[PDB]
Amino acid sequence: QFAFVFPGQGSQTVGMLADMAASYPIVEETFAEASAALGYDLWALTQQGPAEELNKTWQTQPALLTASVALYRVWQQQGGKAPAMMAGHSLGEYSALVCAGVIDFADAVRLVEMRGKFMQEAVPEGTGAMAAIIGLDDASIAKACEEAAEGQVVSPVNFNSPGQVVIAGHKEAVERAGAACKAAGAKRALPLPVSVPSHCALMKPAADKLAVELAKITFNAPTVPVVNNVDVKCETNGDAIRDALVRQLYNPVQWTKSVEYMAAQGVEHLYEVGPGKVLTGLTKRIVDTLTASALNEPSAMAAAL
Numbered sequence: 001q002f003a004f005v006f007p008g009q010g011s012q013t014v015g016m017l018a019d020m021a022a023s024y025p026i027v028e029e030t031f032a033e034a035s036a037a038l039g040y041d042l043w044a045l046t047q048q049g050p051a052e053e054l055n056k057t058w059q060t061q062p063a064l065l066t067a068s069v070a071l072y073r074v075w076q077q078q079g080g081k082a083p084a085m086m087a088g089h090s091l092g093e094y095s096a097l098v099c100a101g102v103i104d105f106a107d108a109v110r111l112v113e114m115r116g117k118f119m120q121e122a123v124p125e126g127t128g129a130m131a132a133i134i135g136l137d138d139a140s141i142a143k144a145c146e147e148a149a150e151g152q153v154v155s156p157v158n159f160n161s162p163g164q165v166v167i168a169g170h171k172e173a174v175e176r177a178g179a180a181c182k183a184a185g186a187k188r189a190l191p192l193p194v195s196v197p198s199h200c201a202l203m204k205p206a207a208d209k210l211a212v213e214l215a216k217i218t219f220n221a222p223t224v225p226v227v228n229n230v231d232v233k234c235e236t237n238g239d240a241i242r243d244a245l246v247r248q249l250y251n252p253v254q255w256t257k258s259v260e261y262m263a264a265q266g267v268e269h270l271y272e273v274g275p276g277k278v279l280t281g282l283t284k285r286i287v288d289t290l291t292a293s294a295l296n297e298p299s300a301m302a303a304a305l
Contacts, residue, residue: 002269003262006068006088006095006291007250010062014049016296017067023298026077029251030070030105034062037106038113042066048135056198058116061091062109068095069105071295074274078305084267085234087258089116089279090158090198095249099273100222102241107217114213118206119196119249128197129174130157133165135187141165144184150174157199159256161195161285203250211246227255232261259286271295271304 021027021043031043045054046063054060068088072095088096091112128238133141138159145154146169154169154177167177178189184218197203219238227234228244230251235241259282262270272279272294283292295301 001265001270002266002272003049003085003087003271004083004096004099004266005259006086006092006099007064007272007276007279008088008090008092009057009064011188011274011278012046012054012060012064013275014046014051014054016046016069017070018047018075019298020071020074020296020301023164024077025076026073027070030064030073031066033106034066034109037109038062039259054170054279056116057120058113061094061112061116064091064274065095065108065112068092069098071301072099074301075295075305077117078301080305082224083271085225085227085262085264085265087229089255090229090248090253092274092279093226093229093245095225095274097222097241100224100226102220102222102226103217104290109220111217115210115249118209119198122200122206123195123197123198124197127171128168128202129171130166130168130192130194130197131174131178132190132192133167133178133181133186133188134190135163136181137162137183138165141167141181141186144180144186145169145177145268148180149173153197153201155200156252157197158253159172161256161282163285164282166192168200169202170197172247199248199250199252201250205248210249211242214242216243227261229255229259231256232257255282256286259283259290263287264289269293 034040123183152170152173154173156165157168158166225234225303230248270292280292280294
């Protein structure tokens with residue numbers, strides 16, 4: 001069995017999917033549909049940038065969602081078979097819900113532009129921070145964060161693989177936690193170029209605004225199970241999925257456990273349906289019994305069909 005996994009923020013690069021668009025007309029057709037919903041040319045933004053425009057999060061999230069749905073449509077159009085299940089990393093969870101038939105594509109494009117705007121405005125610029133902690137187990141990272149919090153917020157927010165955890169919170173608490181993790185044996189504490197402290201308690205005001213928007217959208221039952229990030233559960237009910245997306249914004253992304261759950265269900269290969277190869281590289285570190293590959297080059301797509 002194989003599963004489809006969808007990347008989030010961090011995987012975009014200006015010029016992404018240029019070769020796929022050249023072989024498959026449906027890629028630019030999917031972007032034209034998203035441009036009509038947004039009021040600007042989203043394909044031109046992904047191909048020309050500049051990179052700081054593509055990295056503004058209310059523009060990055062529609063761009064990545066549309067890039068993933070375009071690749072899924074190539075697979076479907078070419079007669080590819082249904083994956084056993086789907087999962088996506090943070091923004092990628094929205095790409096999975098569109099491909100599984102839960103949210104209409106144009107509704108989702110507008111919704112993730114709004115998710116980026118609410119995220120951007122949740123906390124004043126220079127208040128928050130994010131950092132990757134390399135080579136330390138999860139329990140020790142959680143302990144280092146607890147000691148460093150000192151009346152602020154700093155939490156492990158992305159469990160990406162054993163030995164790769166991203167932490168986020170107030171800027172100063174993140175610096176203290178990084179130091180404490182280094183002292184406890186962490187190989188590296190790399191500050192990330194993001195000031196939005198995603199997936200921790202400081203995002204709760206943005207989650208409250210997102211909940212209001214999610215309620216206005218029709219949710220349909222998924223045609224393929226989607227393992228969500230916050231609970232590592234497959235839900236079918238519209239309100240349960242809406243609730244999981246609201247809580248997703250201020251709670252950790254459980255990526256390690258999602259991949260472990262797919263392997264326990266019998267999945268043996270993961271295809272990454274989006275730009276880059278970030279989730280492909282993490283797979284073997286979680287369970288090296290799993291294989292993984294990315295479907296973003298025409299050669300790989302042809303080899304996979």
